[PDB]
């Protein structure tokens, strides 16, 4: 239909999200074909989806059609937030792009689950140590 | 010329179980159902118990084929954990390497 949009990918833990952000919109967000308030019943998850637009004062101005797979509820929310923020940079000034970068909205989170080691209860949790 | 008497006994158990496997399966089939009369099942129970003791597959013990170690055996290679490491650490096992991740 000739409408302007940008597409970008976001990654968080084991969750991968691809977000399509339209230049002009009414503020609707579709996640896997479902409205965002239904896909993320947790309030905190909807807080993250508001972070990219609210930081640049662009609430209710773009339509987002994003699909996310894998991970948990919060990992999906974090994955979408990164994907939307990267695509949102195509419709804002360069100075605001740097502001988003300095706010941590354009950095892929490298924190992933640490593996368990033999001889230990967990990644760092050791077995109970008896002196005698 | 096996590793020890315990390995030799296991070979005798495996050989006897293979010979009696067909006969034991047929008799055991009469017992694991509710169709045949209980009289016929009781006869089958005595018949299968009359088979030689070593013919039972439950008496077969998986042992290392190199050192006859009872436990710590990898079933894929049929080697004990100590013997498996000796071959693996020298690069003599194809595609097996130390795991770091």
């Amino acid at each position: 239909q000739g409408m302007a949009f940008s597409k970008s990918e976001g990654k968080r833990k084991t969750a991968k999200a691809e977000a399509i952000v339209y230049k002009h919109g009414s503020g609707r967000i579709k996640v896997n074909g479902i409205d965002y308030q239904l896909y993320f019943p947790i309030t905190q998850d909807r807080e993250q989806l508001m972070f990219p637009f609210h930081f640049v004062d662009r609430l209710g101005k773009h339509d987002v059609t994003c699909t996310v797979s894998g991970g948990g509820r919060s990992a999906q929310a974090g994955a979408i937030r990164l994907a939307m923020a990267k695509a949102l940079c195509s419709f804002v000034t360069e100075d605001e792009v740097e502001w988003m970068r300095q706010a941590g909205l354009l950095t892929t989170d490298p924190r992933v689950r640490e593996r368990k080691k033999p001889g230990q209860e967990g990644a760092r949790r050791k077995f109970t140590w008896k002196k005698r | 010329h096996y590793v020890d008497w315990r390995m030799w006994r296991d070979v005798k158990r495996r050989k006897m179980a293979y010979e009696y496997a067909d006969e034991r399966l047929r008799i055991n089939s009469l017992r694991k159902n509710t169709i045949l009369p209980k009289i016929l099942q009781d006869v089958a129970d005595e018949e299968i118990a009359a088979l030689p003791r070593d013919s039972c597959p439950v008496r077969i013990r998986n042992r290392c084929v190199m050192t006859s170690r009872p436990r710590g055996v990898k079933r894929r290679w049929r080697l004990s954990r100590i013997v498996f490491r000796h071959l693996a650490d020298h690069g003599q096992l194809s595609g097996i390497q130390r795991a770091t991740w």
């Binding site: 503020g27 019943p41 309030t43 508001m50 609430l59 | -």
Partner: protein, 352 residues
């Protein structure tokens, strides 16, 4: 008073009252609504010391049909469906207020899900040995029903003789209030009392004695599944419950002289997914067939006109104590977080 309107009569509400809250008198609140109000809305009424209800479009469309009903024609079943928390129950409550003011007989079911789950005392019915009785659920509803329709209890009189025990029985021609009072006093016969009331009201409605409104909220629980179990932990079908069986008869459009208004509710439903709100998805094959034909009515989230007035009403009562709430930027965050959902907005604003 931007979000308020001076017209408290539901019969005069029109498209010019859309998005405006009208106050409901405490006398009506104790009488028209002794039950069926949402648990969170009751807290709002108690905190604000007043009951204000927004005049939304779905309620008006249903009120328009009621003002043009043909009592000669059989009763028409109206189904209120919509996403979770969109305001289906309060739309049904607004409809009930209109019928109560027009001297209609109110047959209000607060939530049909309460009758198919968590029944500590499940007793076999004496009238029918193949059914079960719910003395706790039946007796509670009789007290609510008696308060709502206290005026019509004496005017309405039974047309048959009903036997309760070897010693006690209700004679023909006695007022209907005796049957309701018997169920309240005799909790054992409470389940049978409700069936008698449903049988009498449905029968006499077609005689033109009174206008009967059948208001069932969460109607999808009628033709679904129950968590109740027998002594041998066997599942119990909903039709095996006498209380449910009597209510199924009322829903069929085999009687005239009134209207049937029902509202779906996924909240509290049994064996239903959270994101299910459509009629056939919740009712199922059996539920949809029983109600067929019927007139669905959609309930959606707040439009910008409705949402803005909802914020103003909260600010009018000073409910939004946060300093950033009245600001335009603060309003934008509320709109985005809730997506203009009535329940989400109320819950989010309940701690701001």
């Amino acid at each position: 008073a931007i979000s308020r309107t001076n017209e408290n009569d539901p019969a005069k509400h029109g498209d010019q009252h859309e998005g405006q809250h009208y106050n409901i008198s405490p006398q009506d609140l104790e009488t028209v609504f002794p039950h069926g109000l949402p648990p969170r809305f009751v807290m709002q009424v108690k905190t604000f010391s007043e009951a204000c209800l927004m005049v939304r479009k779905p309620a008006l469309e249903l009120l328009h049909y009621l003002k043009n009903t043909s009592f000669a024609y059989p009763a028409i079943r109206y189904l209120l469906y919509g996403e979770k928390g969109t305001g289906k129950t309060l739309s049904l409550c607004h409809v009930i207020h209109f019928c109560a003011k027009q001297d209609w007989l109110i047959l209000h079911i607060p939530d049909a899900h309460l009758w198919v789950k968590n029944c500590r005392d499940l007793l076999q019915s004496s009238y029918n040995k193949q059914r079960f009785d719910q003395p706790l659920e039946a007796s509670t509803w009789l007290k609510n029903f008696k308060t709502t329709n206290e005026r019509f209890l004496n005017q309405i009189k039974v047309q048959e003789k009903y036997v309760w025990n070897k010693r006690e029985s209700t004679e023909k021609g006695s007022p209907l209030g005796e049957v309701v009072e018997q169920g309240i006093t005799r909790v054992r016969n409470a389940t049978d009392a409700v069936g008698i009331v449903l049988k009498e009201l449905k029968r006499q409605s077609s005689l033109g004695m009174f206008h009967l409104l059948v208001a069932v909220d969460g109607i999808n629980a009628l033709w679904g599944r129950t968590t109740l179990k027998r002594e041998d932990k066997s599942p119990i079908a909903p039709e095996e419950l006498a209380l449910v069986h009597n209510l199924r008869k009322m829903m069929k459009n085999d009687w005239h002289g009134g209207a049937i208004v029902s509202a779906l509710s996924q909240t509290g439903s049994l064996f239903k997914p959270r994101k299910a709100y459509l009629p056939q998805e919740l009712l199922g094959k059996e539920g949809f067939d029983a109600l067929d034909p019927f007139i669905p009515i959609l309930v959606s989230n707040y439009n910008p006109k409705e949402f803005e007035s909802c914020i103003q009403y909260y600010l009018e009562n000073n409910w939004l104590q946060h300093e950033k709430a009245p600001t335009e930027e603060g309003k934008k965050e509320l709109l985005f977080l809730s997506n203009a959902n009535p329940s989400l907005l109320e819950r989010h604003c309940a701690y701001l």
